[PDB]
Automatic annotation (TrEMBL), chains A, B:
Binding positions (Zn(2+) 4): 102, 170
Family that this chain belongs to: Belongs to the FPP/GGPP synthase family.
Annotated residues for binding of Mn(2+) 2: 102, 170
Entry binding sites for Zn(2+) 8: 250, 254, 268
Gene Ontology MF annotations: (2E,6E)-farnesyl diphosphate synthase activity; dimethylallyltranstransferase activity; metal ion binding
Positions that bind Zn(2+) 3: 102
Organism: Trypanosoma cruzi
Alphabetically ordered keywords of this record: Magnesium, Membrane, Metal-binding, Transferase, Transmembrane, Transmembrane helix, Zinc
UniProt binding sites for Mn(2+) 4: 250, 254
Cofactor: Mg(2+)
Residue sites binding Zn(2+) 9 per the record: 250, 268
Residues binding Mg(2+) 2, per UniProt: 102
Protein name listed in UniProt: Farnesyl diphosphate synthase
Length: 360, 360
């Protein structure tokens, strides 16, 4: 059976299980079950399923080199799909909540969930809560007797916590750290002293890389009972390297990909985000360019946004991206080589993950 | 050592552990650690600690009748305090998110967390996420080697899910179920056919009783390794009975307790909530009283709110509350008697929980 089709069939199974349990154990009525079914479909489906499919791909890699009964191969693939959906539902939770936190308008070419007429923020915050609760219901039901259940739940909660910490790093990245104070309304920075490569790397590591690359790779190893087969420090290093590149691509797309292709009107400039473009620009700008950036960044005014986009184009940030990309290709290839010492199979899944990221 | 003082000392220990881990493993800077320390204090402290202290009280009950080394008694009490704080932090998560969902103004005589000038909804949604993530960090750290870890995490995630389902039942209680639809803005009911005792009991059971009574009682049994000592079906029945009474008290207080004592301006009438007062009023009103209720309920207009409060006073709902209370006293005493068959100690903790609820 083809990987994507198995993955999508498992979504139907998981959905039916969750909705049937709400009826038999939670006293749900048919109308609220329908609302939750539509919420699950709208928030969980329509993406590329890159995170979920990475778990499946890692597990398939090991099945090709490990001896198992057919029933065991089916069980491992079904566990990889359920684990992959845990990650997709975790992402769905953070997209719902982040779109509300940021006042976003569109997501995946459609309105953000909270903007649906019959949803509203009052419901959407709780719907996002339910999405993450469903990841735990899935784990306890499908993996009840599995030897990896403890390790999987412990890893999943560390990654979820790291992600929430990353969201805090992201939403506060335009403020001066010494001025953070719940009692005082937060002004935007004027000096941009905290727009540095090291601070940018911390935001990205926590807000994206743990759940987008580390969790799918390690979940694939856990469902395969193959973690003792790899060097965990190399898995962490390669995940944080590919994840950073993935976020740099997203930051560039936010500013330069047309809204039809991107599926939204990007507002990182208006939001004064500590993006790869702003940090890189400040890393090469002269005094006049820095001054013009400070006078225009973080403002809703489209003329001020146009000035910032022009500064980025005039600063030839394409050259910096090509240099960054060449360095990442180099380091990712080095880590893949080190991963071959203990597992050529796992190093190959990492090469596939990299190729899919680099070529998207 | 006195129960409350041990419980509060453990808060300091848990706080220091969480903040120190953010520094050593999550690359946090001192300013963001301070923001999170103030967020934890503001959202977790200041209440009565009824839920957390129930875990401690149940564990103390068993220590009085069970043989243990002194070091074991200290370990069980410390585990009961950590488990009690898991529940208090879970409540802190739901209060932060519910205040944002409901547009609430005050909580515990102070502004709701999202209303603090340096917080905002953008941060507060994520702060509420972190509060629940901290419950899992606490469990995995303090209970890593405990025999009850699996049962405790499985119970905690079922209770959290039941609570989020309850929040959905609550926020949609003023809509007609057949009209629920993410695509269509939801009108308030005109017939109030879903304001019935059975529907009210479902909202309350899920939104309050699992986390306020069931979870503290069962967590006290788990940390004491005493679950096989009680009949779980009686624990569930007594928890859902006391929890319902607790919510009925809160619904009456929302409408009639002055804002200074309540710590907020109650708005259940304006919000068209399916409260004990509305269901009970509709259960005894004549046609004219029903018609006047329909013309005034669920409106911000203070004159319309005053009409509803007058209808409640004229309908002599105090008599219905006294009859409900007499019936609860009767059923709670019956369940306490049944609990004595297997454990006089546990039945006594249930009597204390009831006395604290009934006399508050
Ligand atoms: O390659 C693109 O996505 C398009 C693109 C444009 C542009 O469209 O003018 N400008 C860019 C700059 Cl300044 C930096 C980087 Cl890294 C990419 C681009
Ligand atoms: O006992 C109170 O909390 C006060 C109170 C008042 C009132 O203050 O007029 N009115 C009530 C009604 Cl209609 C029903 C119930 Cl059960 C209680 C009250
Ligand atoms: Zn965001
Ligand atoms: Zn972006
Ligand atoms: Zn609410
Ligand atoms: Zn209330």
């Amino acid at each position: 059976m083809a990987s994507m089709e198995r993955f999508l069939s498992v979504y139907d199974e998981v959905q039916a299980f969750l909705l049937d349990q709400l009826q038999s154990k939670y006293e749900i009525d048919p109308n609220r079950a329908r609302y939750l079914r539509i919420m699950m479909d709208t928030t969980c489906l329509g993406g590329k399923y890159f995170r979920g499919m990475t778990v499946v791909n890692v597990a398939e890699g090991f099945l090709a080199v490990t001896q198992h009964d057919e029933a065991t191969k089916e069980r491992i693939l079904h566990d990889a799909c359920v684990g992959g959906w845990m990650i997709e539902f975790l992402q769905a939770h953070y997209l719902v909540e982040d779109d509300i936190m940021d006042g976003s308008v569109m997501r995946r070419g459609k309105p953000c969930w909270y903007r649906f007429p019959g949803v509203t923020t009052q419901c959407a915050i709780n719907d996002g809560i339910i999405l993450k609760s469903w990841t735990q219901i899935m784990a306890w039901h499908y993996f009840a007797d599995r030897p990896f259940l403890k390790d999987l739940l412990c890893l999943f909660q560390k990654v979820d916590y790291a992600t929430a910490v990353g969201q805090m790093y992201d939403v506060t990245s335009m403020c001066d750290s010494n001025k953070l104070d719940p009692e005082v309304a937060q002004p935007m920075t004027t000096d941009f002293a905290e727009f540095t490569p090291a601070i940018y790397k911390r935001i990205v590591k926590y807000k994206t890389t743990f759940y987008t690359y580390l969790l799918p790779l390690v979940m694939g190893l856990l469902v395969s009972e193959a973690a003792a087969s790899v060097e965990m420090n190399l898995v962490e290093r390669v995940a944080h390297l590919i994840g950073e590149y993935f976020q740099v691509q997203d930051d560039v797309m936010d500013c330069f990909t047309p809204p039809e292709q991107l599926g939204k009107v990007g507002t990182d400039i208006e939001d004064a985000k500590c993006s790869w473009l702003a940090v890189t620009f400040l890393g090469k700008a002269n005094a006049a360019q820095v001054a013009e950036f400070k006078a225009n960044y973080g403002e809703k005014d489209p003329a001020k946004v146009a000035v910032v986009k022009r500064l980025y184009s005039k600063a030839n940030l394409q050259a910096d991206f090509a240099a960054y990309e060449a360095e990442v290709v180099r380091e990712v290839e080095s880590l893949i080589e080190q991963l071959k010492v203990k597992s050529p199979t796992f190093a190959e899944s990492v090469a596939v993950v990299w190729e899919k990221t680099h070529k998207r």
